Design a protein around this ligand. Structure first.
Ligand SMILES: Nc1nc2c(ncn2[C@@H]2O[C@H](COP(=O)(O)O)[C@@H](O)[C@H]2O)c(=O)[nH]1
Length: 191
């Protein structure tokens, strides 16, 4: 039912910068974390596929890694976030990846796709300054071999565009990187 995966990582500070009021734990993180692993089909995310109910016992061995790499950055309950991501996205690839394998896949993908690490050397790390879409995609392609998908958000008040997420696209095997085909960023953005 799926032809690929979108492995979506979020930049905590940027994500939380849009919540103009209230608390947001993401305001203090300094590394990219996991938003989700989304099975794809025909250029769109497959969602809410019939499948097994979320079962925390299937990933109990990964709780340390998941609390570190897949915390919620908006709320406080990490498990609630994992459950939601499984039911809305994970079920769509359960035909080949059971819950344990799906979450292990996301963890391995995160450990194998260190965004800041790939940008740091080329002086492209975050600093609240303007960055080039082609430059950033170029540095990530040079390091990982394929083009990532960049996701930006515009501040409703200043109209300034900020990088909020980076997508690594994978083939249906969930291991072979492929080029992403869409960005929601303009030629330049703050990072
Ligand atoms: N993007 C995002 N959503 C989160 C996070 N923690 C909890 N959520 C919740 O998960 C929803 C994301 O749904 P998704 O787009 O992954 O299907 C959000 O609307 C929000 O209510 C987080 O760290 N990032």
């Amino acid at each position: 039912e799926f032809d690929s995966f979108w492995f979506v990582q979020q930049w905590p500070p940027a994500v939380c910068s849009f919540q103009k009021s209230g608390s947001c734990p993401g305001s203090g993180l300094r590394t990219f974390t996991i938003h989700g692993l989304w099975p794809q089909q025909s250029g769109t995310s497959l969602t809410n596929c019939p499948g097994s109910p979320f079962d925390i016992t299937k990933i109990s061995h990964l709780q340390s890694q998941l609390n570190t790499l897949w915390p919620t950055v908006l709320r406080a309950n990490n498990q609630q976030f994992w459950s939601h991501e499984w039911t809305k996205h994970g079920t769509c690839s359960e035909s080949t990846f059971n819950q344990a394998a799906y979450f292990k896949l996301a963890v391995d993908m995160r450990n194998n796709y260190d965004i800041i690490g790939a940008l740091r050397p080329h002086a492209a790390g975050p600093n609240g300054r303007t960055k080039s879409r082609q430059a950033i995609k170029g540095f990530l392609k040079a390091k990982f071999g394929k083009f990532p998908g960049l996701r930006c958000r515009t501040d409703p008040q200043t109209k300034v565009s900020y990088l909020v997420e980076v997508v690594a696209c994978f083939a249906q095997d969930g291991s072979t990187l492929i080029d992403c085909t869409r960005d929601t960023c303009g030629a330049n953005f703050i990072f």
